[PDB]
Design a protein around this nucleic acid. Sequence first.
RNA 1: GAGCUGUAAGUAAGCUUUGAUCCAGAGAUUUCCGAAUGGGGAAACCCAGCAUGAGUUAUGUCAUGUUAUCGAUAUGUGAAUACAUAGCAUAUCAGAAGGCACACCCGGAGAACUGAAACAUCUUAGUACCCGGAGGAAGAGAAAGAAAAUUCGAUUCCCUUAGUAGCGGCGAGCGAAACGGGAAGAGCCCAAACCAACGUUGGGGUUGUAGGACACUCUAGUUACAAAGGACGACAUUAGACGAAUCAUCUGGAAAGAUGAAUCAAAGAAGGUAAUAAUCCUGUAGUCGAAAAUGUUGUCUCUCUUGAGUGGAUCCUGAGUACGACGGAGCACGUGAAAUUCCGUCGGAAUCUGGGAGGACCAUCUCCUAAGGCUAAAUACUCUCUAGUGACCGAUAGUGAACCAGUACCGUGAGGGAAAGGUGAAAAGCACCCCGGAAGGGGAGUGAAAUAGAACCUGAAACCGUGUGCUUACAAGUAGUCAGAGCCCGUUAAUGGGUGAUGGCGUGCCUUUUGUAGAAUGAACCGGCGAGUUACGAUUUGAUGCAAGGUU
RNA 2: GAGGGUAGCGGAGAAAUUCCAAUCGAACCUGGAGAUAGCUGGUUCUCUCCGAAAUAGCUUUAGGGCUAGCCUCAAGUGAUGA
RNA 3: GACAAUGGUAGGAGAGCGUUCUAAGGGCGUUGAAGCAUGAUCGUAAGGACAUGUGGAGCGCUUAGAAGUGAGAAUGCCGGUGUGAGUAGCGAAAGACGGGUGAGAAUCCCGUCCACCGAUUGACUAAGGUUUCCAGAGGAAGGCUCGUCCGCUCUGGGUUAGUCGGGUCCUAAGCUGAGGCCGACAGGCGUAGGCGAUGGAUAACAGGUUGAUAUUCCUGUACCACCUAUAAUCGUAUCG
RNA 4: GACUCGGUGAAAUCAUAGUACCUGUGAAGAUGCAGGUUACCCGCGACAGGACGGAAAGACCCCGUGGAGCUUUACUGUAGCC
Length: 91
Amino acid sequence: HIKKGDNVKVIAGKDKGKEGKVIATLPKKDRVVVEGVNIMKKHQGILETEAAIHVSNVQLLDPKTNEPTRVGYKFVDGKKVRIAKKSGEEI
RNA sequence: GAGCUGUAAGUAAGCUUUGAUCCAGAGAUUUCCGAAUGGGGAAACCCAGCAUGAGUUAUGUCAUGUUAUCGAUAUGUGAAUACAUAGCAUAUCAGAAGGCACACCCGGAGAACUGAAACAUCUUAGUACCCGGAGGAAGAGAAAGAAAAUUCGAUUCCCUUAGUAGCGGCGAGCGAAACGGGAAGAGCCCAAACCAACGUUGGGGUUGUAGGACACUCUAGUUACAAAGGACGACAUUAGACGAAUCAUCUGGAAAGAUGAAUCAAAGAAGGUAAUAAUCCUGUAGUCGAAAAUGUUGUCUCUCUUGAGUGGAUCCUGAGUACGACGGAGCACGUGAAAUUCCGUCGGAAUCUGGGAGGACCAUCUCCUAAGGCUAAAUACUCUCUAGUGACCGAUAGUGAACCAGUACCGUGAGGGAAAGGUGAAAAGCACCCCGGAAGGGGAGUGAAAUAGAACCUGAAACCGUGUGCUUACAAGUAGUCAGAGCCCGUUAAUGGGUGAUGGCGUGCCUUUUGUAGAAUGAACCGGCGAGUUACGAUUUGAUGCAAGGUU
RNA sequence: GAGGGUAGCGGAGAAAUUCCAAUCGAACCUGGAGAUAGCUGGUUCUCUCCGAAAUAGCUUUAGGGCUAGCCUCAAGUGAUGA
RNA sequence: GACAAUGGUAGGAGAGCGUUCUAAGGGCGUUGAAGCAUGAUCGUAAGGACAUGUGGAGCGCUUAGAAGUGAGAAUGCCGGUGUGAGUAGCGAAAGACGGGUGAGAAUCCCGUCCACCGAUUGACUAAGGUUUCCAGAGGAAGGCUCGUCCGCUCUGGGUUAGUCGGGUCCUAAGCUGAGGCCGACAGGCGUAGGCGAUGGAUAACAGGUUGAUAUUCCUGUACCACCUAUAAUCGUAUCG
RNA sequence: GACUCGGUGAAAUCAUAGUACCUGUGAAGAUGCAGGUUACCCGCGACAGGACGGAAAGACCCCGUGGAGCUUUACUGUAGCC
């Protein structure tokens, strides 16, 4: 659904409306780490680190107008491509 | 199509768009024990022969293959004993052996407690157990039949006939069938007479509205029975792919909730997501896809293939069988007037002008043709698969087992057998300071909440403690009830709440008994669990529809 | 002392109903099996109306059962009750 | 608005309360559901509301339907916790003192006296057990008290054979046996042949050494079986 | 051993208990009922009369149309033998 290094928007949670770059992925549990989201404080001094959120809480913005949208698959070329729902432009 | 190195957090060293892991169909490798099979043996071990190979100056050692016992088939196959029909040796073999599914099927063998209010005939019962065959089913099956109609026409299963006929120390109890309505539905091959070959099957032929041999007119079938061995196109099964439609505001640690305005539907089945989502995620409706491997089939291929036979004198069918007597068993039917069907022992028929049956037996009539074999479909059952369903369970429940359970543990052994689920949305699992040898604890910090800190959701009663308002050391108490001063409080607001100087009355509860304070029985206390239910028949009452008719 | 043999409708016994894995007048385990019990014990919420018997006959019967007699609920026939 | 009825066991009849689930309709809940705790509330009974604290996600109402639908007794089953009660007991026996260790010593370590066994409580070895053996480090639980200690916990170690005891040697009892005999089925007997010590045969001794092994390792001297090459009898042997 | 101190620390039993005596009464032998008499609250060491004291659904006795073992000229069968 969301690949590593793509740009997404937080749709739900405590940081709703925060653009970031995915920098990690956990497909086994469906969780993804997005930079600047879910910062947590650990005890071991206090080392602040970023927690992983649910993959169903982030959306990909349109390339042209930066609008959160769903991903489609036209599959014209021999390799399938990700197509933005709002506009056919590839995401 | 970007991540990966099982459960599992870490600590490491590494692989991967040259496309890793992961999923599916085919191949390779596969130690030792175990039918275990080279010989032994206390299974998972020990000890050998033969052949061919490396190693070693040689011996010791090592590696890869072969050697169990019984069957059916070659070869030699000279003992008592001069045919020889003992043994005895080698060769060949998708020949056997053992193991499951508390389940279904056929056969062998075969109890008891119990009921009859005792008990032996009888019943429970041809049931349990044991053994031995199998097969995806088995078994049965092409009339020596059912009957009495102006007849039907292989077997099996369901409804009905019916709790009827009948059986029975005629007690207790047991218990049919044929007609009629349905599911399914095809039937064939041998022996014999005879015709050709030197106890191989070569032809010929298969039966009752009588057949064949023998004399006589004369141009389709398929390996699921009916004889059996292959070549040839299309659908499904075992990984997948695409797949419509939402944005704000308020309360929150968090929106899917509330408040407004928009949307998709051949998709409003469901499961997740920091709370209750048709439009956030995985899916659903619908529509596509198969290297290679299985199964079901369709086509031509392949094999195999002569049918009506008018006469009718002579010939043919299945024997120690059919049947009888004696002793048993089986048919709903206990020897009874017991027909029909079987086993052991003896005696023993007929031959188409024959033989058998129609509930003893005879006559007449009617219907069939035994003593050889094979045969699919309608039926029974469920280890274990792939989809699903529930006015079923929700941790003392549900399988003994929601946890690594037939495991802790118990027994020499065969066997018996438990207890144990829940932090949070996210480990964000309390850095640091202080008391202490530690354990533990008080602060700080994380979080929405730490009376959520892993002996971790909620946290009832028994039971054990601390503080306090009233009360008690002259008193005889199933401990309560009615009457009633003083002292301390102030509620769901009303003829209020707590404590109790003193007076009247009063010998627990259950079970069982003519009768219990009873010294008759039962309970240490608290919690959970724990006993007239269901399926087929009969009868009566209420309700309801129709009515000389009602209902399948 | 070591290694062996005899098993329950059975073994062993210089004999006691003595022993066969800590209870043997007939061992242990699983199954038929929820054997049978005319005998004991137990059997869970609340109100309203009515309300007994402990007798007769028969009984392989006497602490069991059956019919009759006394209770209750309905539908009926009418002074037939005291 | 009138008169008349209402004690009750075994039993008969009638009307109701509450619990779980289901179908329709209509409603509450993070502005806090169920459950739990408390109170001076309502109805003829079984029972029904309301407020507050705790709790943190489900649950009432109306009519009808369907039941694993109501607990104080069964010497009832399972779990938890009392009473007796700070009561009985703490499993044959001689100990004392001075040092050491340590948070903590009648109980651990070292030393000196004393006491007990000595056909033995001493020294070796079969069966059986199966790491209980050694060293350093530990004190939650186990040890009938204590514990710094341990047959307890953690980490790392320890068993050396041609000759000792068993296999490539033999056999008793007994147990299994190709063919074979006998039996409803299984399977019961049994010959040749095999298996089977508690017995027969059979080549090593004395010292030394480790925290833990010794006829095994080491030092010094032996013996048995089997291989290889080279020399003695100048064979009509030799092996069976 | 018991008894007094330090350490450790069970069991049978148990309807709730603020648990006196005498004469009488009662299902006929009362801590609990009637009438009298006596008794300030709470411990420790001892004795054993009674709570029909506590361990075992009384083995004696009688009942069940209940079991099991044994005996015989009880009934009906049977191995075996002639």
